[PDB]
Structures are given as C-alpha cells and as structure tokens.
Amino acid sequence: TGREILEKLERREFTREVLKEALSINDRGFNEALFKLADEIRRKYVGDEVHIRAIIEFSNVCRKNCLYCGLRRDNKNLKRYRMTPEEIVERARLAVQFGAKTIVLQSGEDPYXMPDVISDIVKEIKKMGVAVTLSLGEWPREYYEKWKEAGADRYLLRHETANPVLHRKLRPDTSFENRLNCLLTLKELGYETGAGSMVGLPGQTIDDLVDDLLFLKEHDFDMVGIGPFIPHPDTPLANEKKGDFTLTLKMVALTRILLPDSNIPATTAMGTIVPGGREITLRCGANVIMPNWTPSPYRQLYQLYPGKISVFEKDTASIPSVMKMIELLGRKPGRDWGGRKRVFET
Ligand SMILES: C[C@H](CCC(=O)NCCC[N+](C)(C)CCCS(=O)(=O)[O-])[C@H]1CC[C@H]2[C@@H]3[C@H](O)C[C@@H]4C[C@H](O)CC[C@]4(C)[C@H]3C[C@H](O)[C@]12C
Ligand SMILES: C[C@H](CCC(=O)NCCC[N+](C)(C)CCCS(=O)(=O)[O-])[C@H]1CC[C@H]2[C@@H]3[C@H](O)C[C@@H]4C[C@H](O)CC[C@]4(C)[C@H]3C[C@H](O)[C@]12C
Ligand SMILES: C[S@@+](CC[C@H](N)C(=O)[O-])C[C@H]1O[C@@H](n2cnc3c(N)ncnc32)[C@H](O)[C@@H]1O
Ligand SMILES: C[C@@]1(C(=O)O)N[C@H](C(=O)O)C[Se]1
Ligand code: SF4
Ligand SMILES: [Cl-]
C-alpha cells in the first residue's frame, strides 16, 4: 500500500524494494503525498532559500559522441562556437552585477581550453568574490587538480546512468567506471561534487532508476542534477520516447528524501518538457535554479536537446525572471554562495 511505503520513507527504511515500489505506484494520492514529503524535507533541512547559479555555456564544441546529445561530434548540422576568455570573464562579471553568487561554466568536451585557459578564467572570476562551478566533462586528474588550485569550488559531472552496460552503449567513448573514477577524484580533490542522471533513456528500466538513487545515496553527493531524456532530431536517439515528467519528478523527490541536505536543481529540461516544470520541481524537493546566462548569438546554438527555454528573450532576462519565480513561489533568494550545509545525523 502507498501508505506503508510513505511510512517506510518517513522512517528512513531505504531498501531497494521500498524505492522500487515508490517508483512503480502510479496512484495520484500516493504521488502527491510523496511530493509533499519531499517538499517538507526540503523546507526543514535546506529552508526556503533558492540558490541561483548563473550558467554560461561557453563552447558547444565536443570531442565525444554520446548518443543522446545534440552536441555529439557526429552532428554536422550544428554551428559550433567558442567564446573568448575575455567574453566569458566579462559575461560572468555581468552576472555578478545582476546578483549571481555562483557562476557555472559549462561546455562540450572542447580541448581548446583545457587546462590552462580554464584556469586563467577561473582565477579572474574568483576575484569577483563568488563561487565557481565547472561542468566540463571527463578530463585527467591533473586538469581537475589545476582547476582546484585556480580556485574552482564545485564540479558537476552527472553520472547519466548507473547501469554500466547502458552507460557504455550510450557513451561509446568512455564508461561508467571512468565516470565514477572522475567523480571520486573530484571528491578527493575537495570539490563540492555533483552527480545525477537522466530519466527515460532508451532501454532504461525502473530497476535502473532504483540503482541511480542507491548510487547517489552511497556517494553522498553535494549536488544532484536530474532531468528527463529529451530526444534530439540530429542524433541516433531521435525517434525514441521522451522521459516522463512525473516519473522524473518522483526521482527528484526521492533524491531529496535520501539526501536531505543536498543541493538539488530544478533543471531546464524539466521546464522544457512541461510548461512551468521548474516551478513544480522547486515544490517537490528542489532548492536550486540555474538561469541561462549564455549571451546571444551563442545561446541558441547550445542545442543539447530541442525546444530549450530561455532562447527568445533578451540574454539578461533570466536572472530577473528567476527572482520573480522565487517570489511568486513564496521563497527567498540565497544570501550566500549556497554551498552544502551538512546536517549530521544517525
Ligand atoms: C494548486 C492545485 C489545485 C489546488 C486547488 O485548486 N484545490 C481546490 C481549492 C482549494 N482552496 C483551498 C484554494 C479553496 C478550498 C475551497 S473551495 O470551495 O474552492 O473548494 C494543487 C492540487 C495538487 C497540488 C500539488 C500536490 O499537493 C503535490 C505537491 C505537493 C507539494 O507540497 C507542493 C507541490 C505540489 C505539486 C502541489 C502543488 C499545488 O498545491 C497543487 C497542484
Ligand atoms: C548592474 C546594474 C548597474 C549597477 C551595478 O553594477 N550594480 C552592481 C550590484 C552588485 N550586487 C548585485 C552584488 C549588489 C547587491 C546589493 S544588495 O543590497 O541587493 O545586496 C544594476 C542597476 C539596477 C540593478 C537591478 C535592480 O536593482 C532590480 C533588481 C534587483 C535584484 O536584487 C537583482 C536583479 C535586478 C534586476 C538588478 C540587477 C542589476 O544589479 C542592476 C541592473
Ligand atoms: C551537455 S553536457 C555538458 C557538460 C559535459 N560535456 C558533460 O557531458 O558532463 C551536460 C548534461 O546534458 C545532459 N543532456 C545531454 N543530452 C541530453 C538530452 N538529449 N536530454 C536531456 N539531457 C541531456 C546530460 O545529462 C549531461 O550531463
Ligand atoms: C545545468 C544542468 C544541471 O542539472 O546541472 N541542467 C541542464 C538542463 O537541464 O538543461 C543539463 Se546539466
Ligand atoms: S553529453 Fe557532454 S560529453 Fe556527451 S556529447 Fe554532449 S556535451 Fe559532449
Ligand atoms: Cl553549483
């Protein structure tokens, strides 16, 4: 019964069978109660502040060929771009002027920058007195070490799927073992480390989603980014089904229940598949939002998936828009860098 599963989640009996049953029950009453539980856990543990991370997608060049991603190297039907270091630093400064207290630098796996141009950019942004998060993919230990010495605070490296077989099929340049090794290296180097997965990948099962949740709980990640798979027409997965919004929202809710003190974004992908999806997600366990701060004319070229929101407006609209969102949700903007604030428990 749904009531017994909720009771077990409330008492922290996080077994495989409790998680499977939570993800398998489709009853509206149960789902609503689950979302209420996650919302309440979020409020009790991380409060009403919603942390704003301004994202600059500074290059859409990529050396990898992931089957799901519109930036894959085999996609010839995409104009490739690279922002200059000066452009990236000055765009970061504009975000800080607008009130961002974290800058996220995200790109394809673009060799050009690596490692020294990134280090130089990071040092300049750090002078502005904000947190810096990198989301650049898989690189050698030495690059991660350089970037930590340069001052980077956090690294986002979604694990994508914790099924090694599926991982290798979808990401044929690499492996789950490599992805995990990168995540473990990032943790050892002292980064606040983010992981997370897509929901609704072709071939992915409910038991695979359970394994994503257990993986996340095992490693105690500081941040967890979850969204639906969204098929991209210039990829091998073009004709596959999009991930289900409700199922993905349940994964976000369970992540908060499992990791009550973690930082969990309401991802752009959630707002792409359903109008108002980020707002829903902020009320079902999430406590972070990542407004797009990539300048025109580049923003519209960072086409990981189609239909991405925030492209038709002026490039400075997103930070004000999320501040309005936070207010209409009855929430508060973050007052500090929004680093993880651990609550040690039993
Ligand atoms: C806004 C809509 C519809 C509410 C509604 O329209 N209900 C009838 C009127 C009720 N009023 C009290 C305003 C008047 C009553 C007198 S009246 O004479 O109208 O009947 C309600 C219906 C179900 C609600 C969600 C679920 O909980 C799950 C979840 C829990 C989290 O924690 C917060 C997020 C989330 C997604 C919820 C958000 C929101 O809250 C929802 C969509
Ligand atoms: C960038 C320009 C020119 C002046 C400038 O370069 N200003 C640097 C401010 C740096 N900080 C954000 C760190 C100040 C924090 C002050 S605070 O007292 O909020 O802690 C300034 C002038 C007016 C400022 C907007 C308005 O105000 C309204 C609103 C308030 C929100 O809040 C943040 C968003 C928004 C849209 C503001 C953004 C930005 O800022 C604006 C455009
Ligand atoms: C575009 S990559 C950029 C950073 C770095 N290259 C990496 O892969 O970690 C950022 C994330 O986009 C997500 N993503 C890629 N293609 C997607 C798609 N078709 N649907 C939804 N999310 C997608 C993946 O989960 C990936 O971790
Ligand atoms: C920034 C990011 C995240 O969760 O950290 N969200 C992105 C999105 O949903 O478009 C894909 Se990676
Ligand atoms: S998911 Fe990251 S590594 Fe894979 S193709 Fe897209 S940008 Fe490149
Ligand atoms: Cl961050």
UniProtKB/Swiss-Prot annotation:
Positions contributing to [2Fe-2S] cluster binding: S310, S318, S321
Swiss-Prot/TrEMBL cofactor(s): [4Fe-4S] cluster; [2Fe-2S] cluster
Record-linked CDD domains: Radical_SAM
InterPro entries membership: Aldolase_TIM (IPR013785), BATS_dom (IPR010722), Elp3/MiaA/NifB-like_rSAM (IPR006638), FeFe-hyd_HydE_rSAM (IPR024021), HydE/PylB-like (IPR034422), rSAM (IPR007197)
GO molecular function: 2 iron, 2 sulfur cluster binding; 4 iron, 4 sulfur cluster binding; metal ion binding; oxidoreductase activity; transferase activity
Binding residue positions for [4Fe-4S] cluster: C62, C66, C69
GO biological process, one term: water-soluble vitamin biosynthetic process
EC number in record: 1.8.-.-
Pfam families from the UniProt entry: Radical_SAM
Function: Required for the maturation of the [FeFe]-hydrogenase HydA. Catalyzes the reductive cleavage of S-adenosyl-L-methionine (in vitro), suggesting it may contribute to the biosynthesis of an essential sulfur-containing ligand that binds to the hydrogenase active site [2Fe-2S] cluster.
Subunit-level organization: Monomer.
Name by which UniProt lists this protein: [FeFe] hydrogenase maturase subunit HydE
Gene source species: Thermotoga maritima (strain ATCC 43589 / DSM 3109 / JCM 10099 / NBRC 100826 / MSB8)
Lineage, uppermost ranks: Bacteria, Thermotogati, Thermotogota, Thermotogae, Thermotogales
